[PDB]
Amino acid sequence: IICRDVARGYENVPIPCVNGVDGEPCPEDYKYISENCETSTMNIDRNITHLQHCTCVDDCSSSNCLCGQLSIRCWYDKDGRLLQEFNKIEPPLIFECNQACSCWRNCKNRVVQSGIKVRLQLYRTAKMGWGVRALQTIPQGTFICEYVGELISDAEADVREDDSYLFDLDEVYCIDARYYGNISRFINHLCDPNIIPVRVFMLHQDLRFPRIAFFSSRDIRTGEELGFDYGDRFWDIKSKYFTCQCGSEKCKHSAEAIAL
């Protein structure tokens, strides 16, 4: 109701921005992109002959699907949500079906590659700047969005002046959503998170470059802020500049908890 779509039509659904808290205009100090970009020589391995793929002529719901087997099993139910018994603490690598597979584009193992389905909103929070919340009920296990931005080396990330939007992919590579990013750059840290990041492979299987997919870790109410646990590789550094405002009774990074 301040901006009708911060994604400028690049996502399956519009992502509006509103501010009912202070006077800050909807953010524009970044470039919205819906897929990861490169700014240097990366040479992602896109060799189609390198892709592990399945020979299924059904909808890939069977345990014989190789792509499922690479994932230990396919973790998506008939509605494309993670199984309840999915390891939310230590997620497996997910290998979705791809362009080398025999199956059709509508098979059951292509959730993340199909993009955003739920209604989300960029909004102004009370104490953590901008954040992202749901405009609908979101059952546990639902794909939300991908952490998208600028692919950079470990070495490059570590000389980045702004280290508020760096996501480590595993000697490793990093997604910096500071200058280039999607709606996920706006998701805040919660010590009692309702979404989890998962490493996924789709159109390539270059293990240096998993793509980061957020799934709901429990049922989410309309209007609830989305957030994940950023982890200690973030807060070890960042807590010396600011403290956690998630307000949870289990908060691990508050001004208080650090003092206690």
Binding site: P91, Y147, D154, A157, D158, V159, R160, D163, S164, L166, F167, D168, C174, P197, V198, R199, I212, Y230, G231, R233, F234, W235, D236, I237, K238
Partner: peptide
């Protein structure tokens, strides 16, 4: 230990 903050899975 790195010089910059990194979110992680």
């Amino acid at each position: 230990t790195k010089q910059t903050a990194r979110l992680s899975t």
